[PDB]
Amino acid sequence: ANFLKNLHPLLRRDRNKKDNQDPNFALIDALNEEMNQVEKDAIESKLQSSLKTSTSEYLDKFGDWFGVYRKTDEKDDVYRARIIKYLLLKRGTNNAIIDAI
Amino acid sequence: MRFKKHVVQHEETMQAIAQRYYGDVSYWIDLVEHNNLKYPYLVETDEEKMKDPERLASTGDTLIIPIESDLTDVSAKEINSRDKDVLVELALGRDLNITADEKYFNEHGTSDNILAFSTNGNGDLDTVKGIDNMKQQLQARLLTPRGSLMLHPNYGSDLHNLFGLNIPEQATLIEMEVLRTLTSDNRVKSANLIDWKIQGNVYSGQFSVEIKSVEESINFVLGQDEEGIFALFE
Amino acid sequence: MRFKKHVVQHEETMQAIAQRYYGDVSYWIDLVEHNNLKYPYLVETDEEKMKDPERLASTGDTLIIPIESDLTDVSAKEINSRDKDVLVELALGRDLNITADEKYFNEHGTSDNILAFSTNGNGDLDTVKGIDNMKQQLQARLLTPRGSLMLHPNYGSDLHNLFGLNIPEQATLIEMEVLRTLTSDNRVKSANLIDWKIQGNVYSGQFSVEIKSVEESINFVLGQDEEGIFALFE
Amino acid sequence: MKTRKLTNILSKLIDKTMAGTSKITDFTPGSASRSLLEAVSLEIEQFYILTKENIDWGIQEGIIEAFDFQKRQSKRAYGDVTIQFYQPLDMRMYIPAGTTFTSTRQEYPQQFETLVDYYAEPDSTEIVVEVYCKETGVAGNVPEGTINTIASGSSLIRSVNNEYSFNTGTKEESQEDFKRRFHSFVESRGRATNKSVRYGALQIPDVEGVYVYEETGHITVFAHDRNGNLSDTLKEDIIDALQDYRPSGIMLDVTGVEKEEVNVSATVTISNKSRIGDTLQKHIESVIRSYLNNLKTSDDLIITDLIQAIMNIDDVLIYDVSFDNLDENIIVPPQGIIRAGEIKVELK
């Protein structure tokens, strides 16, 4: 969101008093809105690259890498908890069998 | 690839066409072979052409002459005045008008937030072409401080620092800086001082700018046909 | 080793800094890597910098630009007048004032036990700097007989023997000896006669001495930065 | 990344542009504003697409990095060479590591060498040695009867032969094959289970398949390499890898699969008799070798399957096929496997 900063210095950055319908300010604010929205989306994208904070599609990618597939109507929180539990399954003892049952 | 196309003229012959283009009548048989014509090559009117439309051509029909033509090496004298106007317009480029409202940024030349886009009155963005384009670009370069523009250290001018004393020396500095800024443009063939004066605070000067001639712009644009870009990355 | 240090300016960007110093915006990623900055490189104010003080920089924070800077090859025009004064003062050296009480050793120039140390009024030894230093050294050389100083046969002057007759010849001898004594100083770029006269007993003359210019002294001192001595062993 | 598309971005830009000013009202094709906004939105679309792709790549890379589960490189081929002498050796002979073996068959010019020192006992007439292809990848999978030259030059040697086709050379591990081994890792985090034993046995890259045969208080791990053999070094390595995974207190044993060695002789008729030659014979032989040496543990051999595999090479050119050594399908038990013996083809 450095679009106004790196813009050509002579162009106006502010809607001109002489005309409320200044098309230059309209175009500039439009482009600035898209720049800031893309920056927002890029900042929020970090949550998809972590198992802790991943959501639907990327969480399904993680579960496909771990081997665990989403059930019918299975939300993200319970699904990630199920993946984490599936990785940490004790096996080979009475307590493990009792928990599995 | 490009080839010449000839319109059959009244009571023309293939021998005359061959002499006219190839400079020898001997190529008339090649012209027949390439165009696939039957013996009455150039019929009098379309009633005869109805007998065999495929293999005959009438008056006003277009023939193809397979000679490799090229738009460069063409005598500018043939080119129509409108065609020359369009060619120089292409050469000097089309750009979005920003130097509208001359009075405002003439009242505040050294400051920022001085110029802005505008509309052409037809709900589309305004555009300056040819001489108007050159005016816009030269004004913008002169007005831009040097090194302020991103990705372009050398674009601009040092006039914002030349607000010095009232002596001939600063006048000469201003003149030299202005000549440097004008010479920086590739399209400006040369620039030179006309007259200047000092009225205490106020300095006044005027310059003469010779843009590239019609012939050079025509040659440049017709050469560009080989690439098909028809655009300016100077 | 020395490097440039940049203070973040209001609403500055890394691309602008890279263009300003490296002459190309492409080095902004190198600038980030060297300074270890997170994505919002130049925050608006210190409230944002509180969120991550290590990895963010705000306005008024100092960045490091690893370009090998050197104090020589710097345009003297940038240097401040006080800085130039201090540089020429260093160039021409600081020494303990001995030529105090000008009247006394001017009344007895040829004799010994003529000059002595003095105090600066602040309980420290008196010191002469710059032009005062040059005055002291030139007076002392002129007054010192040649060969009398230990460890320095050639330092001094032969004026003590030039108390000859009243004719132009002895005048010329005095003038030549004075020019030799002044030329012996490395800092004296040249010396030349101005005017002289003879009033029977008394001879009178005056000279013009051109010390090394500000530019030369600045270049010498800034070159000395590479060694760090900042002292004079001429 | 929300996976926006070009049309919505352009519509949003044009709507805001109209809302900021009533002067701009020409957004038709060929207009300057529309072209500029189109280019901007296209670049935004490409940025979003590439960001999605890079995030997918980053997820695979973080999976690889976190567990240090490095992907399998190409394996160099290896197999067994037999040697015969003129007469039973009077003495302990020697063959050093790096002794080269080559083949005069120009169709398979690859080279092989010993990685181990060998000796023979007095009064022995032949010896077997294991040789590795110098070059990695599939190139070292020569057929049986290829290697016939020894570069040691020793006079006592009568003849040299690889009795079986090499099959252990392979290229880089495929995407799905890597993905399946990682699932086995995840399952085998619980050490003492049957799948964990199978993973520990498969932890050695040389091992091809494993069948864990389970009894009360006893475990038998049938394992094999990509040739169907199980060398003592490989058995020891499997054992050492299973120490961490096998259950404590239960007996465990490692043994080689029940390998079956199918020789084939096929009489094939050809419609276009000009095509007869050495190329067609060698191509058919190659196809048969590839079919048999792709059989897994417990795959039965079905003669009609082999017939269709041979005939699908060219259904017009090939007329009829007949086998001179096979008459009935071969049943393979769970711990068994089939591998190609001598493959021969007669063109008629």
Length of chain A: 101
| Residue among B96, B124, B127 whose CB faces D26 most closely | B124
Q: Are D120 and D92 in contact (CB under 8 A)?
A: yes
Q: In whole angstroms, how far apart are CA B45 and each of B17, B60, B61, B64, B178?
A: 19, 9, 10, 19, 67
Report H helices in C101-164: 102-107, 131-143
Q: Are D339 and D292 in contact (CB under 8 A)?
A: yes
Please give the single-letter amino acid code of residue B27.
Y
Residues 82-141 of D with CB under 8 A from B: none
Tell me whether residues A88 and D23 touch, CB distance under 8 A: no
Give the distance from residue B64's alpha carbon to the nearest chain C alpha carbon, in angstroms: 54
Paired tokens of C67: 């370009």
Q: Are D78 and D137 in contact (CB under 8 A)?
A: no
Q: In whole angstroms, how far apart are CA A38 and each of A43, C109, D44?
A: 9, 87, 8
Whether residue C22 lies within 8 A of chain B, CB to CB, comes out as no
Query: B116 to chain A: which residues are within 8 Å by CB?
Result: 11-12, 16, 22, 24-25
Closest CA to B130 of B100, B88, B96: B88
Q: Are D168 and D79 in contact (CB under 8 A)?
A: yes
Whether residue D51 lies within 8 A of chain A, CB to CB, comes out as yes
Q: What is the dihedral of CA C52, C57, C59, C64, to 10 degrees?
A: 160
User: Which region holds residue D304: left if phi is over 0, alpha if psi is between -120 and 50, else beta?
Assistant: alpha
Cβ partners under 8 Å of residue B182, min gap 6: B138, B142, B188, B191, B207, B209
Find the angle CA(B163)-CA(B168)-CA(B172) to the nearest 5 degrees.
70
Location of structure tokens 């010849």? C169
The contact set of B with A (CB < 8 A) is 98, 105, 112-119, 140, 143-145, 148-150
Find the angle CA(B49)-CA(B55)-CA(B57) to the nearest 5 degrees.
45
The contact set of C with A (CB < 8 A) is 11, 13, 15
Tell me whether residues B112 and A10 touch, CB distance under 8 A: yes
Please state at what angle helix D278-292 crosses helix D303-311, rounded to 10 degrees.
140
Between strands D218-225 and D251-256, the pairing is parallel
| Residue among B114, B118, B150 whose CB faces A10 most closely | B114
Q: Are D63 and D175 in contact (CB under 8 A)?
A: no
Q: Are D206 and D225 in contact (CB under 8 A)?
A: yes
Q: Are C24 and C30 in contact (CB under 8 A)?
A: no
Breaks in chain C, after residue numbers (C to N greater than 2.5 Å): none
Cβ partners under 8 Å of residue D27, min gap 6: D14, D17, D33, D34
The long-range contacts involving D152-159, CB below 8 angstroms and separated by at least 24 positions, are: D152/D95, D152/D99, D152/D100, D154/D93, D156/D85, D156/D86, D156/D89, D156/D93, D157/D83, D157/D84, D157/D85, D157/D86, D158/D84, D158/D85, D158/D86, D159/D83, D159/D84
* C-alpha gyration radius of chain D: 30
Give the distance from residue C234's alpha carbon to the nearest chain A alpha carbon, in angstroms: 55
Q: In whole angstroms, how far apart are CA B167 and each of A78, B110, B177?
A: 82, 21, 16
Give the distance from residue A46's alpha carbon to the nearest chain D alpha carbon, in angstroms: 9
Q: A15 to chain D: nearest residue by CA? A: D20
Cβ partners under 8 Å of residue A28, min gap 6: A4, A7, A11, A12, A13
Tell me whether residues A8 and B117 touch, CB distance under 8 A: no
Paired tokens of A76: 């993200």
The SS3 of residue D36 is helix
Please give the single-letter amino acid code of residue D324.
D
The SS3 of residue D48 is helix
Paired tokens of D108: 């398979």
What technique solved it?
cryo-EM
Query: A5 to chain C: which residues are within 8 Å by CB?
Result: 11, 13
Chains in touch with B (≥3 Cβ pairs < 8 A): A, C, D
Paired tokens of C200: 């029977």
Tell me whether residues B115 and A11 touch, CB distance under 8 A: yes
Give the distance from residue C51's alpha carbon to the nearest chain B alpha carbon, in angstroms: 30
Query: A4 to chain B: which residues are within 8 Å by CB?
Result: none
D-C interface (Cβ pairs under 8 Å ≥ 3): no
Rounded CA separation B211/B135 (Å): 11
Q: In whole angstroms, how far apart are CA B160 and each of B49, B111, C158?
A: 76, 9, 60
Q: Are A58 and D55 in contact (CB under 8 A)?
A: yes
Cβ partners under 8 Å of residue C113, min gap 6: none
Q: Alpha carbon C217 to chain centroid distance?
A: 5
Whether residue D49 lies within 8 A of chain A, CB to CB, comes out as no
Whether residue B164 lies within 8 A of chain C, CB to CB, comes out as no
Give the distance from residue D39's alpha carbon to the nearest chain B alpha carbon, in angstroms: 16
- Count the Cβ atoms, other than its own, within 10 Å of residue B101: 15
**What distance, in Å, lies between the first and last C-alpha atoms of chain A?**
55
Give the distance from residue A25's alpha carbon to the nearest chain B alpha carbon, in angstroms: 9
Rounded CA separation D156/D149 (Å): 13
Whether residue C214 lies within 8 A of chain B, CB to CB, comes out as no
Q: Are C65 and C31 in contact (CB under 8 A)?
A: yes
Location of structure tokens 């009548």? B25
Whether residue A2 lies within 8 A of chain C, CB to CB, comes out as yes
Location of structure tokens 């800024």? B181
Rounded CA separation C71/C74 (Å): 6
Instruction: Tell which of D25, D35, D37 to mutate to test the B interface (max B CBs under 10 Å).
Output: D25
Please report the resolution in angstroms: 4.4
Length of chain B: 234
Report H helices in chain D: 6-20, 32-67, 175-187, 194-202, 232-242, 278-292, 303-311
Query: A66 to chain D: which residues are within 8 Å by CB?
Result: 183, 186
Query: A39 to chain D: which residues are within 8 Å by CB?
Result: none
Rounded CA separation A25/A13 (Å): 7
Rounded CA separation A24/A4 (Å): 13
Instruction: Tell which of C11, C15, C19 to mutate to test the B interface (max B CBs under 10 Å).
Output: C19
Q: D29 to chain B: nearest residue by CA? A: B124
Paired tokens of D149: 């030259």
Give the distance from residue C74's alpha carbon to the nearest chain B alpha carbon, in angstroms: 20
Q: What is the dihedral of CA B27, B30, B34, B38, to 10 degrees?
A: 100
Q: In whole angstroms, how far apart are CA A64 and each of A57, A69, C104?
A: 10, 6, 103
Instruction: Tell which of A6, A10, A21, A31 to mutate to test the B interface (max B CBs under 10 Å).
Output: A10
Q: What is the DSSP string of B93-136?
A: -EEE--B-SHHHHHHSTTSSS-BB--B-SSSSB-EEETHHHHHH
Please give the single-letter amino acid code of residue D139.
A
Give the distance from residue A11's alpha carbon to the nearest chain B alpha carbon, in angstroms: 5
Chains in touch with C (≥3 Cβ pairs < 8 A): A, B
Query: A2 to chain C: which residues are within 8 Å by CB?
Result: 13
Q: Are D90 and D105 in contact (CB under 8 A)?
A: no
Tell me whether residues C11 and A6 touch, CB distance under 8 A: no
Instruction: Give all strands (DSSP E) within C21-175, no chain letters.
Output: 62-68, 94-96, 127-129
Find the angle CA(B45)-CA(B50)-CA(B52) to the nearest 5 degrees.
110
Q: What is the dihedral of CA B100, B104, B105, B107, to 10 degrees?
A: 150
Q: Alpha carbon C224 to chain centroid distance?
A: 11
| Residue among D25, D26, D32 whose CB faces B96 most closely | D32
The DSSP secondary-structure symbol of B3 reads E
Reduce the secondary structure of C7-24 to three states and give it as a string: ECCCCCCHHHHHHHHHCC
Instruction: Tell which of A31, A32, A84, A95 to mutate to test the D interface (max D CBs under 10 Å).
Output: A31
Q: Alpha carbon D343 to chain centroid distance?
A: 21
Closest CA to D122 of D158, D157, D89: D89
Q: C13 to chain B: nearest residue by CA? A: B150
Sign for the CA dihedral angle at C118, C121, C124, C129 comes to negative
Q: Alpha carbon D166 to chain centroid distance?
A: 12
Q: A62 to chain D: nearest residue by CA? A: D59
Q: Are C95 and C140 in contact (CB under 8 A)?
A: no
Rounded CA separation B159/B177 (Å): 7
Length of chain C: 234
Tell me whether residues B153 and C16 touch, CB distance under 8 A: no
Identify the helix (H) or strand (E) that includes residue C193.
strand C188-199
Residues 3-32 of A with CB under 8 A from C: 5-6
Paired tokens of A20: 């409320």
